[PDB]
Symmetry: D2
Subunit: 392 residues, 4 copies
């Protein structure tokens, strides 16, 4: 299958590419791949483990190997022998210039960038380049996945976001104020009849306009925002207090990280998308609102080794207060990268099975899952297993 990655030179993107190749060459295990669990045996009938890659970027590098290597130098998150083994493969992956339209002040942290909008292109002209890029690469087994930097909250517009007609009128009118890069890539993917997933808390296809487009086109889509680390633990652990009839009175989540993701998320406007995603999970599992504080701060020495410190203050029998602490220490690209490959496979599977619109049953992968109130990790995994079984 083919995967078009928006933000193709990112650490998550390049690790997914390195990882695909290393597994295909038989020099890495299948650990971390949800699609490789016994319950999903038979997936390879519709979505075998075989990947070709293309994508959009705004940072300037020659190919995905120079990109993967840049990240590897700072993080060393796979062995040099894996880097060497996948070199000629990744050297052949060359991203196309994309759009960073309305992607927030955090974008400046990426350094040297080139964009479609910086060429003077209108919305219609940008959509045409984006679509030409993708359609030149795409086949009948192609999926588009957004792993680009996190955008700020979009400028609100009922008219331009509320219906596909309104959104297409937005493009016709070149009303850039109400468009963001993530909507334009999603629009392009769905217009081309290609399954789409959003690994970020940027809007992407999560607006009614694009939800309507996906349904009309009969195209499956999924998101938003990878649930890889702290939020995974949060949606696994929070239910434990509810099952035991305890009240969570306070929940602190402090996340520190470096690298390009920490760098963009350090900006107050970009950060807001992520912070809301992380916070709002508690109410959806508990029914009520614990005093919740969630922060992300740049901490350059950690690079891609995002560390989270959580503190849960909870009441039990006779109103007595008690304390739980956790510290999560992992490489963000390690927990994220296989999920990209898993999502591509589940999207292709769903496409072949005639699924269209929001694949709500893919909630398990996401911190802000579209069209569902299933947030509990355990319930989500059951829903994913049962969905697949019902379609296999």
């Amino acid at each position: 299958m083919k995967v078009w990655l928006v933000g193709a030179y990112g650490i998550v993107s390049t690790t997914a590419m390195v990882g695909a190749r290393a597994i295909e060459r038989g020099i890495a295990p299948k650990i971390g791949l949800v699609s490789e669990l016994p319950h999903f045996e038979g997936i390879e009938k519709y979505a075998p483990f075989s990947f070709e890659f293309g994508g959009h970027e705004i940072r300037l590098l020659s190919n995905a190997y120079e990109a993967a290597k840049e990240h590897w130098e700072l993080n060393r998150h796979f062995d040099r022998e894996i880097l060497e083994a996948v070199k000629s493969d990744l050297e052949g992956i060359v991203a196309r210039k994309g759009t960073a339209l309305n992607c927030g002040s955090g974008i400046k942290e990426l350094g040297d960038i080139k964009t479609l909008e910086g060429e003077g292109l209108s919305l219609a002209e940008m959509v045409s380049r984006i679509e030409e890029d993708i359609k030149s690469f795409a086949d009948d087994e192609t999926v588009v996945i957004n792993v680009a930097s996190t955008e700020p909250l979009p400028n609100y517009s009922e008219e331009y976001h509320g219906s596909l007609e309104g959104f297409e009128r937005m493009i016709d009118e070149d009303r850039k104020e109400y468009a963001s890069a993530s909507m334009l890539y999603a629009y392009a993917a769905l217009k081309l009849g290609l399954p789409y997933a959003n690994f970020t808390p940027s809007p992407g296809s999560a607006i009614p306009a694009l939800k309507e487009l996906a349904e009309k086109k009969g195209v499956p889509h999924a998101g938003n925002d990878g649930k890889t680390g702290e939020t995974l633990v949060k949606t696994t652990l929070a239910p434990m207090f509810a099952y035991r009839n305890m009240e969570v009175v306070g929940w602190m989540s402090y996340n520190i990280l470096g690298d390009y993701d920490g760098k963009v998320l350090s900006a107050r406007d970009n950060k807001e998308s992520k912070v809301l995603s992380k916070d709002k999970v508690l109410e959806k599992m508990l029914g009520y609102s614990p005093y919740s504080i969630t922060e992300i701060q740049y901490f350059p020495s950690l690079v891609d080794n995002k560390t989270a410190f959580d503190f849960v203050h909870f009441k039990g029998f006779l109103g007595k207060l008690m304390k739980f602490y956790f510290i999560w220490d992992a490489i963000d690209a390690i927990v994220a990268a296989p999920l990209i490959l898993d999502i591509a496979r589940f999207l292709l599977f769903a496409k072949k099975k005639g699924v269209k619109g929001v694949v709500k049953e893919m909630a398990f992968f996401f911190a802000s899952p579209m069209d569902t109130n299933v947030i509990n990790t355990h319930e989500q995994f059951v829903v994913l297993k049962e969905w697949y079984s019902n379609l296999k």
Copy 2:
């Protein structure tokens, strides 16, 4: 309903009694009570929130109020106004002298004790006092729950434990070597047609002899070992790694506590029952065996404020190792005490609904649940909800 508590003067026992009374008087909330979750509405039809208490003990105190107060002085785990409010009530609860037969070297840590066996009584004579004590208290809504100190592993015997006939032959023969206090209390309870639960990892009714007895008598029973803190987190969290196809390579669980439970568990023979319970959970959820280390050490300054430190070392994508730490800081009697009341209620419910034998669907309460391979906290809670629904 009536509850006979073996280890009636313990901190868990006395807190359950204090808590029952405080709720009944309307000066405490219902927080911590699983039987009070919306899904279990209607339980009060069969098991209303109303408790009378008796029990067995070996430590010397006048009544359960002097006992509750002893623990309260060191822990202060409920307000003085709760202590005062429940005083005359608990003053009327007077334990009967029980047996500490083969309850391990840790028993010495309890200080001044008196026992049935120290009177020179045979197994048959001890069973008769135990049964006379219970039957004098019991009615048709009475349950027996063991919350006594944790015993060592029992002396192995196929003959005396393997069948009810063999066990009754053991008593007839006064073969004390193959009996423990927890089996004798369980035997007495089941012989009297009373539902029984074991909040400890002592054998209790978890031997084939007594399992056979419960079935024959048509009596429901449950256990073993309250899952209140570290083991709860372990059975909630471990599944998260499996769902994400990660390998747990190492799991450290270090528990430090004081008070009488830490004191008895400091003894190497008693400790073994608990350590096995805590450890064996991982394999049953994962399918394989992470390098697992579990320890309990006495630490007197903490008193009943058991603190656990856990460290999970795990592999993900491309074999990369990552780290998760947690620290649990709670009052053991706070997380345990409502479960005693919940168990009494669910046992009475099951009794009225014609349930008999091991109530495997009560696994949710226990670290070593009898007759089940359902260990996952989420699966256990679903099983408990579905069980109740199917019987309501």
Copy 3:
């Protein structure tokens, strides 16, 4: 001796008062009192353990017992028997209405307040009430200590802060813009020839104008900002990396707390005083600047139980990076309150020994110590011991 406490109804203030009385009555130990260490034996010759209290406040309560009780209800940070024992004593302590001039937006978090400036009083008129309040209480063994809410950074003024003449010209001119409450209380104390200490990071007497005043008057003064918890650990631990020739590349300090101090510090302008104090310590001990992030966030369930999470990322041999984490869990008023009594005693001692100006050798108590580059806790304690020895 007598102690005038600015912010007399605060949790630190009222705990110091409760604590003084309880020790004097012989129902509490002397634990926590630096002035009670063997090395300071003989202090009682000049500053015996004997305290009378008065002070300024802006929150509305009848006396210091109602104030201490308000905090005790939420925190329970000493036993009810201590509360009862010190009741009639604290009932006789009645604060006088003070000034909250330019004390930042965080002041609004205190609820119902009354102030001198809200009466329409000029700077000269306010200074006269403040001075009349203090001088009516003061004797030849009286000290003034500021434990009021933390102020924002003051409005900068070379002219009005740079010399005593400029500062007195500020008052004559009623130029409120360049005055804050903490400077006015400090001015009043020093004008009255009374030793002064600032337990907060508010400016207080730490401006050249007031430093000049203290010298002229021959009066000892000390500050700023109690070093009680996270910053104490930081100044104890940081030196360990320097001694071992390791480079600290990153230091995260995250502090969460509730109660009135967390409430005022939640305001972005007030918070800035504290955050700078906490951060700048590293450079002064290390010679260089680790990437340092320090935050304080309100977290109401913790009340006065401030919890800090720190993360130290450090390089050693061959440039290899390593990790250290700590979690501090204490009651802020517990670590602060004895230091108030200690400071009063050391200030009276210094006064009797003819010390005047900044008592730099009291650095040990403070996170922003005036007139010194001694920050290391170990060096500070040696300096304090040697200072006292040289004057005893």
Copy 4:
């Protein structure tokens, strides 16, 4: 200078060798070297940064490069380019067969070993091989440092350990029962007039017999047991509670590690040497005995990445209990290896300055420092600085 390393193929030993070479070649910084702090400028006059290596071992490898590489494969604790750069250098370092006499049951965990005693050699014959090995390598700038596996407590003997005459009588009598490998290597080193240091808690030269020998020969010696991680933090932090007149009521230290050191220390007899060293530090800094629990458990996934979890329970003002937690996450060989080079340099310095007997002022490096009650890290560092200054 030359350094003879007992346990030459260990991870600490081989990292010190790799590190020496990498610095000398100018491809690594001087971070981690105490001898490279500004205060020790001028050391290079007597002990320049220049190292040749030999040593004793019992595990079977061809040379120190194959040994360093074995550890590097599992730990990756320096870059492959460092490994490559120092290859031909380390290939030329070939250990001589040593003795593992009375080195405990933990020795079995090392796998395939060959020893002098396994040849049938008496004590006198073994001492002669050990001495011939060392004297063939040694010059006038040679030091012997023990970095071999930790031994159990020795068999007690006043006669054979109490005086040099008694110890030499032990050898003459071939009384192996009262000798251990570490005493024999130390004896050999001192008999040859060579400075000696013990990086382990094995006895080494810390018996009166050998202390007497070192004095007679006019030879400087140092130890015992590297203070690199948890014990360093403990001796840095404990003083903070004393300075503030707080009582430490409990201190938990839990250490988990893998690799050969964790493997040998997993044995109950070997472990005892280390556990006593770690524990006894508190009393020497505090004057009293907090309830202290210290454990070391094998945890193979961590390899040389020893992780410690500490919990400090402490009383302050009014007897209120408070909590401090730390987690130490480092590579043991990283914090240890430069100290080996530092110790060699300080020993050579002391030798040239006419120092003889126990160099008590090297306490700073050690968890069980010989001939001193200075345990506080801050006091130790001052003593080290002042010692050097007084001799430079």
